[model samples]
Target: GLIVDTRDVEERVHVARKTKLAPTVAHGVFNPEFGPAALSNKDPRLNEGVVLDEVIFSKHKGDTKMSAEDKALFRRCAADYASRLHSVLGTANAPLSIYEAIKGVDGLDAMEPDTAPGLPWALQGKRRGALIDFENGTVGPEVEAALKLMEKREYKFACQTFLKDEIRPMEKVRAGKTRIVDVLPVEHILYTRMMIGRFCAQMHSNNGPQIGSAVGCNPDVDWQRFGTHFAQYRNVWDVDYSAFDANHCSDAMNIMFEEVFRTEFGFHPNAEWILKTLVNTEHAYENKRITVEGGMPSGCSATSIINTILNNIYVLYALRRHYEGVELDTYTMISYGDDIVVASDYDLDFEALKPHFKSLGQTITPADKSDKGFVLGHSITDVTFLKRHFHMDYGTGFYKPVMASKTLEAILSFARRGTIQEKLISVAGLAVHSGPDEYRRLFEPFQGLFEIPSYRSLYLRWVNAVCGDAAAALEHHHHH
Candidate 1:
């Protein structure tokens, strides 16, 4: 029964992640200048106290205006959420044995009559000393080779606590306490998965600008933009639950990883056995005294990376088999787990591809026009993160961001007293509608926190405020 202050975890343990929460409604006074300019009937107000309150205090219904009780209740809710967050962060994950975790997972236990049992003899070469030479050696070995060797012979899954997830509210001062998933990088699984992911990423991106090649981190991004430079390009069709990592059945993973390794990486026999060892090690979680179920858990090591790679390969293969003579650009297909984008005139073909996706345990939701224009991390769509005041927009297709007001209000209260890192997270959440003057006014309050001694940092902030390009501001951060 420990406490989990997720904000505290951000300050001490976790890296600040970009939140997906955006403004769903525009109740506050908006600047007719900031919202959807293409439409004539968009909301007209900017930098007001009302619209946001509706989002923040949706539960206090006696009147549209909040009462003393509303504010007080909001604060109490915040305190409670913080208490819960603290408890979650403080709790240790259930003891997960690698062997026990993969008990029912297919392929790991049995082998085909023609296939050898367990790891092959080729990989069993030199292990105890060389397999995991994290210290005894310099850079270790090539990830594929090292991982193959470890998966086959050395990597032992001693019982350990998996990292508990830190679910934090998107914005703190708002009335609703809506939350997002924050996967913690606590156990070694985090690193193990990352190394494998990097290798797969290089492989995925090798045939640049193909449909399922490049992966985007956020939505609202036209991932098709990369491949759109060519002709025969139609609108981009996005995939929903593209990789389905959270619920990736071990069975599907077992199937996809083997196929990806064999077809993409060119190793069939070893691929099967390696994945057999790898997929079974995945684990999942809770708060206070947290635990996972019998099946695979999302956000664990290798879980996300492998899922993304496997799903990409699955989509590519589906396209190849289904449209024999249609002439598809398999190279331009882009996928990063659930966030996948592809540009093709073949709308009917994409629709046909959905059934194939279902067989693999993945869901495919079509991307609408609203998803075409903006970038996710840098642009604000329907909702704003951290209750930051900015521009509004219209001319967009229907996309709603509904959140629990009590939950919003509670977490908003909790996040306000959080570290500078937490307070400043939403600086990049506003959309392109925001003007330079608005950014200056919004960020002026926290100049001290974000303005580091580095002149380069100050220059970047000034550029963002003056240019009013949150997208470029984000790109610059990554570039540096």
Candidate 2:
């Protein structure tokens, strides 16, 4: 029988990886091609490696010009971010000093410990179990029980964060009511984790302590496109995950980090060590409400940011080496975390890169004709508004009555379908139903430019559901 770890072998291996000596590689997964069939069993989606492949593929596709002068700018920016972190977090020990100690090995002790308060609870061997208990919302007694169990076990408390995930439906993309977004919560305990990871990332990109003189950032970094670069990777331009085959293999992500920290960046630093120790294993069940396709929950902020950077840099590094025949300049490419916008005169072909990326267990997002329209639940470059004179708030910002009903209808119908039932509730005595047939009928006749989901259509849908005129409801809302 295949042995699924009762304890976190992933975390245990990471702690061992940081120690004085270990023969085996840290955090490496058993490859099914070489292992038994039962051992190979996993979520079919992750096993398929479908979504992971798509996201990296779509994102890594781009070309821009690179000049040495331009490349130097990002190096300086990375250096600047690193120096700032040192000023805020304080610096202790040389980069190599992280590997020498039995205690205080995770970078919490290294971060100018005199200036900082000390490591988070997760970083301490005794304290770490509490964080796990707290995250899962176990009782106080259960928390203490976990602590006792932790005491019985022996591993470095380099520290890592738990990952919690959920979904925000986005119905606009493909099947109306089919677009589902997998969001990984940015837990509070992980701030320290991010700081350390960011520091390590900056060191590689800026200082070159590990890859000496190998610069990673562009001289002139693009803030607007900075996150987009990574977001675009492995993600279709305008499509959401629900529209395609999706899966989660967070375990695979560990390998990318392991390779970068061990092979590219040298021995893992304290921050990297803590990060590895706390890295969460994949968690999620099939969402019957949505399609058969879905993604693994993803942490948007610190956890994913650093993981993407490590994976991206490694991939780019390999690509640079593989295509020595071509004039590809990765030095001047701009990447912030996984989001990267690379500039190369050389035409990067998706088809040619597919096999190479797949071998690395990385996938590129399939190409799409549509431009990326929405980001982080907000329309990227426009002030989308309603048609009638009604002011509505969608949380991102406010909108005026600029768009007409048909456009609004498509936007509303698609958008409303994307939301859960609670989002459709209104103070105006209306409610959005689970099924959207009535919404389609209400907005079907009114036609104009199509809109993405927002508060206006949703609110109006609620209004119409209550058998009131949308414009009149807005007028009444205005008077109040």
Candidate 3:
């Protein structure tokens, strides 16, 4: 018998967005000043908890004892990778012209603004209905304004960004730790989205997987592929970077990045311009304005793509150095935005190559062997990738995919305390992954409450489908 009003929900969303409050913790007051203090207090053992901009500007100091021979080997491996990548992408010796790069963004004209993940402060107070309309090709005032800015190609001016603290309560190591995220200008997001879209399309059209690196930025390559590798390989090592986005950084135009792009795109006809415009920028956190020396913002659409490509280079080099005589087919390596899984038919000696990763500004979680298998933290039998649990079966040696326990617990907890519509949406979200049978069992207790005309009418379609379609419906409703 729970009653809800659409107007009230809209008002709440508007207030939260306008105030730059995270919807997850909208009930509590957010203290802006506490963010810096929290970040400073973070354990030094865990990469110093520096902001993304700071990490990007700093030089790699770890593994100072790396021998001259090893450094030469790394550069050689990187060069080889760059060459092979260019040949596969077919941009070898033919760098992308400024016009071509601009042309690549043409697809963004028709793309939905909401499809660009994360909400920038510029679009605050805008209703989901307006965004949905924009997606349907109806250009509202906000969309029109954003398009105008994009047309002007004013990326440099749009680089002035804001920073906000996002408290993640679910963090296991440091609970309620405040993570800093960039709140970029609207036009910057649109341009970034277009670039990311074009880049991903190029990778998808080519034999990207053949590069011996599977970047999650490529939509075609999903976590399911990693699951299959987990099942196929006898020895699977789940590798994770400690504070990856916050600690991993090289100059936007660093030699390695430049060489990689040159080997792939020929030369920097416009890449340098684009990289400098985006990476080197100014940010405002409260009243303090800081100029970033180098590195892209965390919320930028292209950040993930850049991170994956850079990490791929280092990971490939380390793999080659560790297994000098090993054939490429014997090992499987894939990274989804710093969450890496390296599986092999033979046992992996990750410890030997730890210094290599360190020297490249990547601090990996120490690898340890458990009774279950080799793991990053503890149990290899229960490995988590992209928030899904892949459990290993000893009898058949196959890894089965299921919902992570933490995710399930969070959903259940949210369902327990929320408006009726919110509860229905939460259950429907859970149902998408849990499937019909499990969903029914889980919803049994609340069946009577949900069956009421008031609540059932809101999510009847979701209740019946119990699939991705159902989740999509809930997502649409959530936007409203």
Candidate 4:
């Protein structure tokens, strides 16, 4: 595997063909007749010969009229290609993808989510589309899209129309009047609210470093802060996965994985959000209720939260499409609680996504009595008599690190008592029951013969429950 990795091998062997043309050869590698199956195996030198031959295809047909302009455009295009060559250009990074490009201009970090161009407008996929409203919980894609179609800066016909039709209805909820909204359905209100200030991450991946110059953002220069035009490349758009992983980990180790599956399969996770999503996976499972440790095996597999995540995963799988020789659909998933907002479309069966709406659970809500909506539970509560709103990871109470600490304490208490009955008494109307040994075993680790299983053991439990045999599911279903 490493033998094919020699820079000398490429710089040396290609010394003869590096600057050569790329079209003289009829066929070189990836012939339908023969292809390598060994994962990392490389084709023979004939591949390089073929590559060079294909490079110099239309050799300056008798000094064309726009050769100089075309050449200049070519240089810019090359630079742009280099810029585009990243797994997660503007977002964070992860094991499957590299955050190679998400850096400051010279010395600035990322922009605030609410700040100017904090995240890319591209990720939002054209503000003209339908979205759930954030103000008064409601769902009206057509109304929302209609609202977006109108101009807001002007108070003329368009502005006045929208104001009278849409914005004015919130007056009741705006004043400390009532939670009910007659103009908009409650479901649409929540859905629309979820649509505002949305964030999308292409977690699965993008092209890597090698051919990435011809692939996607400025891989050579800083991408974390300044806009793209200032970078080495400027023409290409970014499918930035800067939101996927830590700022560290670097390109050398991560980029290859980002594009591997995407390059082979039609879609990507970062582009689709399959491989990794957050900078770090937040813990969702509690030992008190689930009895498994170190969270679930498959990343956010809690029954309480799995439906939202499942909807996302389902969308990721649904996005594979073969189009006008492109061989892929251009859809993406943005998972956040039941807040599964998306921002991409290549004219596929997007209506199929309505199924995710059904995945919305019945008994669950943003905030339980013990675990209220992370944003709502910890919000300022009373933003204004006319308007009440929350934020996204805005360092508010419930979603805040402080809330996490409190949750940890509460988790321990739950571990001690076993059920959330007491803590969620408002929701469930009772404390839970637990044997003293369960508490002792949970808090005091070595209390019950150190029966705390290894992470692997815990993983197996989840696998057996989710994917393996029907035993776990049966066990969960039949526990009467």
Best by TM-score: 3
RMSD of each: 19.6, 17.5, 12.1, 29.4
Model 3 stretches astray by more than 4 angstroms:
1-75, 82-167, 170-176, 186-196, 204-225, 251-253, 263-268, 276-279, 294-296, 320-330, 366-381, 391-400, 415-446, 449-480
Instruction: Give a tens-digit lDDT track for model 2, residues 102-209.
Output: 122332222221111112332243333333332233324533443344334322221122212112122211111112223322122233233244344444344221
Question: Which candidate has the top score in lDDT?
Answer: 3
User: Candidate 4, residues 232-263: lDDT per residue as tens digits?
Assistant: 22111111111121111112112222433232
Query: Lowest summed-lDDT stretch of 10 residues in model 2?
Result: 31-40
Model with the higher TM-score, candidate 2 or 3? 3
Ranking by TM-score: 3, 1, 2, 4
Deviation of model 2 at 145, angstroms: 8.0
Off by over 4 Å in 1: 1-198, 201-208, 215-232, 262-274, 281-297, 302-304, 317-331, 367-418, 421-438, 441-480
Indicate whether candidate 1 or candidate 3 has the larger lDDT: 3
When 2 and 4 are scored with lDDT, the better candidate is 2
**Considering summed lDDT, which 10 consecutive residues are worst modelled in model 1?**
32-41
List clash counts for every candidate, in order.
52, 38, 1, 61
What is the C-alpha lDDT profile of model 1 across 246-354, one tens digit per residue? Answer: 3444444454544333323323234344445544442111111222211233433444445555555555545654665433343344455555545544454566666
